[PDB]
Design a protein around this ligand. Sequence first.
Ligand SMILES: *CC[C@H]1/C(=C/c2[nH]c(/C=C3N=C(/C=C4\NC(=O)C(CC)=C4C)C(C)=C\3CCC(=O)O)c(CCC(=O)O)c2C)NC(=O)[C@@H]1C
Ligand SMILES: *CC[C@H]1/C(=C/c2[nH]c(/C=C3N=C(/C=C4\NC(=O)C(CC)=C4C)C(C)=C\3CCC(=O)O)c(CCC(=O)O)c2C)NC(=O)[C@@H]1C
Ligand SMILES: *CC[C@H]1/C(=C/c2[nH]c(/C=C3N=C(/C=C4\NC(=O)C(CC)=C4C)C(C)=C\3CCC(=O)O)c(CCC(=O)O)c2C)NC(=O)[C@@H]1C
Ligand SMILES: *C[C@@H](*)[C@H]1/C(=C/c2[nH]c(/C=C3N=C(/C=C4\NC(=O)C(CC)=C4C)C(C)=C\3CCC(=O)O)c(CCC(=O)O)c2C)NC(=O)[C@@H]1C
Ligand SMILES: *[C@@H](C)[C@H]1/C(=C/C2=NC(=C\c3[nH]c(C[C@H]4NC(=O)C(C=C)=C4C)c(C)c3CCC(=O)O)/C(CCC(=O)O)=C2C)NC(=O)[C@@H]1C
Ligand SMILES: *[C@@H](C)[C@H]1/C(=C/C2=NC(=C\c3[nH]c(C[C@H]4NC(=O)C(C=C)=C4C)c(C)c3CCC(=O)O)/C(CCC(=O)O)=C2C)NC(=O)[C@@H]1C
Ligand SMILES: *[C@@H](C)[C@H]1/C(=C/C2=NC(=C\c3[nH]c(C[C@H]4NC(=O)C(C=C)=C4C)c(C)c3CCC(=O)O)/C(CCC(=O)O)=C2C)NC(=O)[C@@H]1C
Ligand SMILES: *[C@H](C)[C@H]1/C(=C/C2=NC(=C\c3[nH]c(C[C@H]4NC(=O)C(C=C)=C4C)c(C)c3CCC(=O)O)/C(CCC(=O)O)=C2C)NC(=O)[C@@H]1C
Ligand SMILES: *[C@H](C)[C@H]1/C(=C/C2=NC(=C\c3[nH]c(C[C@H]4NC(=O)C(C=C)=C4C)c(C)c3CCC(=O)O)/C(CCC(=O)O)=C2C)NC(=O)[C@@H]1C
Ligand SMILES: *[C@H](C)[C@H]1/C(=C/C2=NC(=C\c3[nH]c(C[C@H]4NC(=O)C(C=C)=C4C)c(C)c3CCC(=O)O)/C(CCC(=O)O)=C2C)NC(=O)[C@@H]1C
Ligand SMILES: *[C@H](C)[C@H]1/C(=C/C2=NC(=C\c3[nH]c(C[C@H]4NC(=O)C(C=C)=C4C)c(C)c3CCC(=O)O)/C(CCC(=O)O)=C2C)NC(=O)[C@@H]1C
Ligand SMILES: C=CC1=C(C)[C@@H](Cc2[nH]c(/C=C3N=C(/C=C4\NC(=O)[C@H](C)[C@H]4CC)C(C)=C\3CCC(=O)O)c(CCC(=O)O)c2C)NC1=O
Ligand SMILES: C=CC1=C(C)[C@@H](Cc2[nH]c(/C=C3N=C(/C=C4\NC(=O)[C@H](C)[C@H]4CC)C(C)=C\3CCC(=O)O)c(CCC(=O)O)c2C)NC1=O
Lengths: 324, 285, 172, 162, 164, 164, 177
Amino acid sequence: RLGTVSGNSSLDKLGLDKFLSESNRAYTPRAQPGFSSEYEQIISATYKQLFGNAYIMDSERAEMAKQESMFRDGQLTLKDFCRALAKTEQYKKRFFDSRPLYGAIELNFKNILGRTPDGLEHYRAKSAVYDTKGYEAFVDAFFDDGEYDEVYDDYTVPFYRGYKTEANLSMAAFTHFFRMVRGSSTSDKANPNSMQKDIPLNYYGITKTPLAVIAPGAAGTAYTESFAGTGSWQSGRAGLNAARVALGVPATANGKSFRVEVTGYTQPGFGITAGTAVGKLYKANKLSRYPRSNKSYVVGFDELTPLYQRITKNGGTIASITPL
Amino acid sequence: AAKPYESGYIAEDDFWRGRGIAAWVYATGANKVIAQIVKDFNLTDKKFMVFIPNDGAFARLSPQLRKAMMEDSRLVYDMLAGHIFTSKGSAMLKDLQGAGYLQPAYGEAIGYVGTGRVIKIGNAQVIPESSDILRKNLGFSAHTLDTFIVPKALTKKVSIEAGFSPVTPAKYVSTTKADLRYVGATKPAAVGGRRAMNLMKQQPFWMYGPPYNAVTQDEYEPISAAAPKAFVDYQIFAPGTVKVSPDSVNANELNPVSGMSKYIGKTQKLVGDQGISDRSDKLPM
Amino acid sequence: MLDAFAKVVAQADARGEFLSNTQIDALSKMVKEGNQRLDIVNKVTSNASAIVTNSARALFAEQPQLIQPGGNAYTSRRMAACLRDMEIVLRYVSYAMIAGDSSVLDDRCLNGLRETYQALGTPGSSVAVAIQKMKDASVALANDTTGTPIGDCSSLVAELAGYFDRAAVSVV
Amino acid sequence: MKTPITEAIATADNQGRFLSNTELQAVNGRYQRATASLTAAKALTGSAQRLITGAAQAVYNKFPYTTQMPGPAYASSAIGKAKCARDIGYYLRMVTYCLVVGGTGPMDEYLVAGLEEINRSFDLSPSWYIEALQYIKNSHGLSGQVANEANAYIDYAINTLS
Amino acid sequence: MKSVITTVVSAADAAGRFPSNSDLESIQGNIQRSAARLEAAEKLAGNHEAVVKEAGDACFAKYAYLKNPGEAGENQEKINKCYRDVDHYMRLVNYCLVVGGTGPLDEWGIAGAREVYRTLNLPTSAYVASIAYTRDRLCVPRDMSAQAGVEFSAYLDYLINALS
Amino acid sequence: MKSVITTVVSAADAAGRFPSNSDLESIQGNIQRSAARLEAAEKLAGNHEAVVKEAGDACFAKYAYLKNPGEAGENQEKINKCYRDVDHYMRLVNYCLVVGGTGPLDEWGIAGAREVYRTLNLPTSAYVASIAYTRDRLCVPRDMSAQAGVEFSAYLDYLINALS
Amino acid sequence: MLDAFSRVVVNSDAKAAYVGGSDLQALKSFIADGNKRLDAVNSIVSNASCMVSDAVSGMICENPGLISPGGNCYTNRRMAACLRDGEIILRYVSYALLAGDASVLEDRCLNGLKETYIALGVPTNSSIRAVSIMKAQAVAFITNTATERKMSFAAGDCTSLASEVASYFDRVGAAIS
Ligand SMILES: *CC[C@H]1/C(=C/c2[nH]c(/C=C3N=C(/C=C4\NC(=O)C(CC)=C4C)C(C)=C\3CCC(=O)O)c(CCC(=O)O)c2C)NC(=O)[C@@H]1C
Ligand SMILES: *CC[C@H]1/C(=C/c2[nH]c(/C=C3N=C(/C=C4\NC(=O)C(CC)=C4C)C(C)=C\3CCC(=O)O)c(CCC(=O)O)c2C)NC(=O)[C@@H]1C
Ligand SMILES: *CC[C@H]1/C(=C/c2[nH]c(/C=C3N=C(/C=C4\NC(=O)C(CC)=C4C)C(C)=C\3CCC(=O)O)c(CCC(=O)O)c2C)NC(=O)[C@@H]1C
Ligand SMILES: *C[C@@H](*)[C@H]1/C(=C/c2[nH]c(/C=C3N=C(/C=C4\NC(=O)C(CC)=C4C)C(C)=C\3CCC(=O)O)c(CCC(=O)O)c2C)NC(=O)[C@@H]1C
Ligand SMILES: *[C@@H](C)[C@H]1/C(=C/C2=NC(=C\c3[nH]c(C[C@H]4NC(=O)C(C=C)=C4C)c(C)c3CCC(=O)O)/C(CCC(=O)O)=C2C)NC(=O)[C@@H]1C
Ligand SMILES: *[C@@H](C)[C@H]1/C(=C/C2=NC(=C\c3[nH]c(C[C@H]4NC(=O)C(C=C)=C4C)c(C)c3CCC(=O)O)/C(CCC(=O)O)=C2C)NC(=O)[C@@H]1C
Ligand SMILES: *[C@@H](C)[C@H]1/C(=C/C2=NC(=C\c3[nH]c(C[C@H]4NC(=O)C(C=C)=C4C)c(C)c3CCC(=O)O)/C(CCC(=O)O)=C2C)NC(=O)[C@@H]1C
Ligand SMILES: *[C@H](C)[C@H]1/C(=C/C2=NC(=C\c3[nH]c(C[C@H]4NC(=O)C(C=C)=C4C)c(C)c3CCC(=O)O)/C(CCC(=O)O)=C2C)NC(=O)[C@@H]1C
Ligand SMILES: *[C@H](C)[C@H]1/C(=C/C2=NC(=C\c3[nH]c(C[C@H]4NC(=O)C(C=C)=C4C)c(C)c3CCC(=O)O)/C(CCC(=O)O)=C2C)NC(=O)[C@@H]1C
Ligand SMILES: *[C@H](C)[C@H]1/C(=C/C2=NC(=C\c3[nH]c(C[C@H]4NC(=O)C(C=C)=C4C)c(C)c3CCC(=O)O)/C(CCC(=O)O)=C2C)NC(=O)[C@@H]1C
Ligand SMILES: *[C@H](C)[C@H]1/C(=C/C2=NC(=C\c3[nH]c(C[C@H]4NC(=O)C(C=C)=C4C)c(C)c3CCC(=O)O)/C(CCC(=O)O)=C2C)NC(=O)[C@@H]1C
Ligand SMILES: C=CC1=C(C)[C@@H](Cc2[nH]c(/C=C3N=C(/C=C4\NC(=O)[C@H](C)[C@H]4CC)C(C)=C\3CCC(=O)O)c(CCC(=O)O)c2C)NC1=O
Ligand SMILES: C=CC1=C(C)[C@@H](Cc2[nH]c(/C=C3N=C(/C=C4\NC(=O)[C@H](C)[C@H]4CC)C(C)=C\3CCC(=O)O)c(CCC(=O)O)c2C)NC1=O
């Protein structure tokens, strides 16, 4: 299901349907000797949250069999178990040793705290712990600042809260949450913007610029774009992504400006003819008609309905429209 | 051909009609093939063993497989030759124990697993309630299966993506007077006349309220604008002929404590019915 | 785009198979309807202006806030663009009826229509009421005789109703 | 994909209008010819292996150097022979797809777009595939307008190869 | 919606398992109980305009102060929105007998209601007096059957305990 | 201990709500389906000494190599522990019938089994091959009633998918 | 996530309509044919381990380049994840068969599965064939046409349930395409 109408709900059909249905709350201080089925569900729930729905095989799950047993009588699950599992080699291999420091820093904000870094000062406060004391205190600052005991009971599993309004964040952090959590059938190895090696919010998390939210399972759900500078000072290059500003005379002539994102551009299907063109298939210089798929446009309002037909009749898929 | 009860059921062609476990071999022409198989592999002298699938095994046979047994008569040949076994001869069920292999008539050494009373021949299971029948003359053993012995080397040519993926046609469910109303809105308003507003349906009773103000159908009529200059005098009639009648002689039905009155004031439009009308009675004028 | 004949060919090329004998016999039935499909496309297209206008007339009778000042259909440019969209959806539903496949319908009309109405503020629950009013004006126009020979077309009117329901859930 | 159905939709959607009787007749003529085309496709499917083994042998008889010369391009080894009976089955399957659809659409999208680029690169000769197609035109055993529909798409592929 | 199906599916999704033998045993309870609660949902859907309007003025027969100046039943619009908001609640009880749980009442009628009826100053004991009147108006052999009235009243005082 | 009662009490606790009408309906399905499985468990009770003996011979018949020196069935003492370990699995499915769900299998027979069997060098396919025998010698109108065989088979396949 | 009964409720709520009369008969039919649906969901989850292993093996036997260096299912970590990618997809289809609506399959599984499979690099043609093999297994156990197992049922026809679950599997191939 997609949309906002027809159910009087917007967030469950924005990718959060499984996450809006669980508690996983560990209602007793120690596991009862004799039974394993209730506490196996809580350990599988804190694996799915803290590792971001990654696959832990049985040869890797046996490497954390010690902590699992300290939790069953003599440790909390929020503190002291998520903290113990974050110091393991399985967490460290895929969330810390693979990325730069600011890439590992926002994966810990998602996995431990359930949100995104707001600005540069959320990044900068956590890199200072690593520079002076190492990794072992770096993962404690996510647990031992004020935010963690405030928002979570110390016997529940963490949950995602970066979209909510009681997590007192900026509104650019709402758009950033739906870049890092794309539905319930996804991990951060299965994310096209961070593939367990990248920094997912690099320019955008620092400068706090908002992004257009594309729902998971939409038509143009496969839209991704690169990053490039544009100016002479930073030695940038023109003509890769469309701008996000609409500055001049073209901003308000032809009405209010919009920013349209197209996804799928192929060589078959350009003309007005229902079929491919047979023959040479490529001009001399051997380039495609669209050298990149995933193009973007900045268009006025009086030019929006001719552009809409120019996209879809040539094979493109509209991913997002956003008024500038 | 003839009746099976003639010559008792002592005839070999009529005995399997009598022991009615495999009725599909005579309903189809499958019994011509197994008579032609034992011609073709000379099994009439030496003892052997057949595993006939029963009725129900032919019924649970898949529609992507039963089509491929009709368009390929070679595939019907070796599937029926895959049930005739010449390894152990006339073997009973107690000699089918353990794990091992079996040589078919045409096909190739199909493995069996026989564990006590449950005996599998490889995607098949011998029902042991009726399976130890031995014929003395032309001697074999016959056991009963619940599924066909289908080797996987035959049926890589079959699939469900050929067109045997089952699909049901979904129906619409409109009622006959439900539209006869709706055909008058398809005409343009110069020729459809009043009937051009036929597509509006019955709103709930609060939708005609003063926040929302849904327009009733009767406005689109001229019966809302019946505002004449002329008037009946009502005093020129005979006394007793002017009749009037109230809606209810009650203070509490004409007006409740709230303003939701069906009779007094501007809340007479808030009825759950009376949103649409019958103006498909007249004409397209 | 690709119709219903091209739909099963593309499903069979990706498996690398010839078409079955059962699959040819199922495409003979699609040619056997043939003329009954072209009667529905003839009746819907021939009354296309009256279906759009009289189901816009009935929408503003039940939701009269859309044409009040501050409503989404109040001005001449904003009313003429509303009738233009209701004719766009009826066009691509008739395109999907002659083809037997809803592929031109979503690749050229529906994909990006929900994103457009969310950037403009157009009420998506009122667009689906206008879609559902063109539906029963057209499935009641489908099963009337009016110069057609008598027969059963109840399987092709369930297909036409399913294209109106598809356009209505892609905007609501 | 080019089809009598989809070319009627595409010529009305380009003009931005509803399907008139200009377009309802182009798909009426697809339905009249569909009975001849569907019997031509059921017969070419059921005799495909005879036509595939025969047409490959018909190329080795006209051009016997293709079973002699060393190299990867030629059908000398058993690997180059298996990649040739696969190429004939591709050309034959696209003909039965074009009969089912009703136009030269499936062999445009899947076979003849980019065909002169993959022949010149892998050093295949288009004269090998013409003689493989002249065999099928002479050996399908069809008659009348059933053979008129089959030979119309066989003759279409010979024009692109030549 | 909170239902019988959606409870046992979500419980076996958080555990990450297939539908067990105890998850099919719950849907059998949805079969043997559907006869009573669909009789109540059909009796209500046919006579709803007379049930709503009988309960809408049972609010104003107990609380005649709502027509005073500044109150919530001053003018014609405010009683149109009041009879609407009662008809909204009776539609959601019709939706709860169909689904089989308190799903549509929770997500659409109860959640967020305390913050709206206090901001707009609608007395929540008068969104109750209409619901409590309908629960005692029901004659158990006359309108519906015995077990159809058990299901009808049990969704009627779930709403009362959620507004109180 | 997954049952029908335990699943709805734990789901009402996870949302902090009282037992609703969606929860008592699931207990109704426990009442209807009870007479099916409670006489299958009565059938398994008085006739367990012969069912495990028949199932015990059906794995050494399939895997006759277990009696080799150096395997898991060398002497009579290691043979006696296999008829014991299959009598436990027939007691734990006798518990699953009277509970109403896959509780007692998930705790005492399945959880921890695939690391006990791997370490102690026991082939799980032979703990399978005796469970799939009593699934196959069961014909539904002779051994029990028509609905008791549906429940008795439903737990044996649950044990088979757990080992396999 | 909606079941069959709550699907007609969100359709009635869009037009302020009560549920009764015409719509209650299509839901009373759901209860009357409801014993078949539990009797068919049991047939799939009883064989749910053999169904998944046979689907990933049969995907490999037809396309044996997947287990080469460069194939997606090469190592043991990749083969065990592909055996688990399909065990979850079968689990959500059995939820939609129990509910009678495809909303739990689209909300929790298919929304985002496409861009899952383009970040990892999973071949969509091979994953569609693994679903297609599971479709043939699900119709065979529902209609009792399995050549390797013979489940006991009461006598009757369940073609509408098999054509229902076949439409759930085709949503998996249309999403990730
Ligand atoms: C002394 C001024 C400071 C300064 C200016 C500077 N600006 C740019 C580049 C751009 N400025 C604009 C802004 C506009 N362009 C317009 O047409 C309009 C009319 C509505 C506005 C407001 C844009 C779009 C650019 C980029 C395009 C371009 O380069 O021409 C630059 C060049 C940046 C570069 O690195 O090449 C400079 C130097 N910079 C300073 O240091 C001063 C403080
Ligand atoms: C053997 C190579 C692998 C492979 C290639 C493959 N690529 C495409 C399609 C495109 N490739 C490009 C890339 C460019 N186009 C350019 O003009 C330039 C210079 C600026 C580059 C780098 C583009 C734009 C396309 C799409 C448009 C087009 O068709 O040209 C395809 C076709 C995919 C399709 O469905 O169209 C293939 C098959 N594929 C393999 O399997 C090999 C590993
Ligand atoms: C009665 C209809 C409801 C309604 C409609 C409405 N739509 C618009 C504006 C646009 N709609 C589109 C969509 C398309 N344009 C196309 O060419 C195609 C074919 C592929 C589609 C699907 C676009 C691009 C626009 C904007 C451009 C324009 O036409 O002016 C508007 C105008 C909104 C505005 O602010 O001007 C309306 C009013 N709105 C309603 O209230 C009805 C429920
Ligand atoms: C009678 C056969 C003659 C012959 C055949 C031969 N062909 C190849 C290699 C290729 N053929 C194709 C053609 C297609 N591929 C397609 O997918 C389609 C449309 C469905 C067509 C028409 C391609 C792309 C190749 C190369 C890629 C591949 O290896 O598969 C070869 C092998 C040549 C090589 O260098 O490997 C042979 C031997 N050659 C003869 O000798 C016969 C006369
Ligand atoms: C009569 C019983 C009351 C009374 C009631 C009023 N309620 C008013 C508004 C109102 N009611 C709701 C809840 C309702 N809306 C829904 O969508 C649903 C569920 C689907 C329900 C139950 C809301 C959200 C609102 C406010 C929005 C609106 O204006 O409709 C109301 C209007 C308040 C106002 O005019 O400011 C009244 C008057 N009035 C009475 O005298 C007794 C207390
Ligand atoms: C159904 C497949 C057949 C059928 C089989 C026969 N079973 C016979 C004996 C038998 N079977 C079992 C196992 C079964 N019965 C039970 O009560 C239970 C558990 C509750 C199970 C799994 C046992 C224990 C026995 C011995 C006791 C007895 O029933 O006599 C049998 C007699 C021959 C034999 O196996 O010794 C047959 C023929 N019977 C049928 O009618 C259908 C076709
Ligand atoms: C699990 C062992 C079940 C069972 C499952 C079924 N599989 C069915 C069809 C089927 N199986 C395969 C894989 C197989 N074929 C191969 O070529 C290879 C190796 C490369 C393997 C492992 C395929 C490809 C198919 C066909 C899928 C399709 O049609 O596209 C099936 C259908 C009918 C039947 O066999 O009765 C079932 C039920 N079958 C069993 O007996 C156990 C219980
Ligand atoms: C009055 C002396 C009669 C009588 C009259 C009624 N007529 C009703 C509706 C009606 N009347 C006409 C004809 C009128 N309208 C025209 O436009 C023209 C000329 C071009 C004429 C003569 C029409 C078309 C209609 C229907 C449209 C509408 O209702 O506005 C009427 C109301 C009927 C009802 O709905 O109950 C009455 C009572 N009836 C009498 O008893 C005396 C004899
Ligand atoms: C179904 C919604 C209708 C209905 C349809 C039938 N039409 C039948 C035959 C038929 N229709 C046409 C017109 C169509 N063919 C064209 O080529 C063009 C324009 C280019 C159009 C509009 C023709 C020419 C024919 C004759 C073919 C024939 O008679 O077979 C038809 C068959 C009659 C029968 O077999 O009983 C049906 C059922 N009829 C209805 O009652 C509903 C309303
Ligand atoms: C049972 C306690 C008494 C009894 C009471 C009477 N009820 C009367 C009318 C009446 N009752 C209801 C509520 C009930 N009917 C429904 O359809 C629904 C919900 C869908 C409910 C809860 C309504 C709506 C009405 C008015 C319509 C009507 O029945 O005429 C009644 C008549 C007097 C009155 O107007 O209240 C009585 C006496 N009747 C009995 O026989 C037992 C003793
Ligand atoms: C087998 C049929 C396929 C195939 C499968 C692979 N999937 C791999 C990883 C993977 N899959 C998912 C989606 C899965 N997880 C879910 O939670 C749900 C639904 C709720 C589904 C369908 C995810 C999120 C991942 C990432 C796992 C992680 O991040 O740890 C995978 C592993 C790739 C790798 O390890 O690099 C494989 C091999 N691949 C194939 O080739 C066949 C077609
Ligand atoms: C109450 C729940 C409960 C169970 C489900 C079982 C599970 C179980 N079985 C065995 C133990 C065993 N299981 C087998 C079984 C076999 N060996 C063979 O030759 C065949 C492969 C197969 C016959 C079925 C054997 C031989 C042992 C004893 C292991 C040993 O002696 O080394 C053990 C180890 C302790 C022991 O019994 O010695 C356990 C925990 N036991 C329980 O207490
Ligand atoms: C009480 C909880 C419960 C179970 C334990 C299971 C078991 C089960 N299955 C069916 C009953 C049935 N199950 C099927 C299903 C099939 N039959 C076939 O021939 C096909 C192979 C297959 C799928 C189409 C059919 C057709 C019936 C007959 C009853 C009906 O048509 O509703 C019944 C009803 C029989 C009776 O009234 O006693 C029960 C209890 N299902 C349940 O609901």
